[PDB]
């Protein structure tokens, strides 16, 4: 704060959507999970297992991707990176999310 002068608050807000009366809109929340940790344990990975112990934390959605060597197994996920779908396609199935 203080100085007596116009504080360094001279900067400005480009951030749009900074606010709205009714508040927040209810939209999905995709969790970025790297397949490197996904490769750690092996069996049949699903949102159930990740939230049960991993890096999901009750997040609304799941989405594997990133660096790492994809182990062989079915990977049920809400979304896939174009590069992510490659590693698993090299040795595994591609179980998409729900729909209803």
């Amino acid at each position: 704060f203080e100085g007596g002068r116009s504080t360094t608050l001279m900067r400005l807000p480009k951030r749009g959507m900074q606010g709205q009366v009714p508040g927040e809109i209810k939209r999905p929340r995709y969790q970025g999970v790297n397949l490197k940790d996904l490769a750690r344990f092996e069996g049949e990975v699903t949102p159930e297992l990740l939230v049960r112990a991993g890096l999901l934390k009750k997040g609304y959605r799941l989405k594997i991707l990133g660096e790492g060597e994809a182990k062989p197994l079915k990977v049920v996920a809400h979304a896939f990176s174009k590069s992510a779908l490659e590693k698993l396609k090299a040795a595994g199935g591609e179980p998409v999310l729900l729909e209803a």
Partner: protein
């Protein structure tokens, strides 16, 4: 109790993943009238700061 995030600062400044603070270039909304294409472009990109970076950190802390 419980530091209150300075909303006036958050709405205008985002912190980098590392530890740096970034904000838009100043002077680009009003003074304008017919400045060199360089200026208006130079003002388009955001930037890093120096000491007061630490200052503005001590606000969006809970954030």
């Amino acid at each position: 109790p419980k530091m209150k995030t300075h909303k006036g600062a958050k709405k205008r400044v985002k912190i980098t993943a590392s530890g740096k603070v970034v904000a838009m270039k100043t002077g680009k909304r009003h003074l304008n009238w017919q400045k060199s294409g360089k200026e208006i472009r130079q003002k388009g990109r955001k930037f890093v700061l120096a000491k007061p970076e630490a200052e503005r950190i001590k606000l969006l802390l809970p954030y």
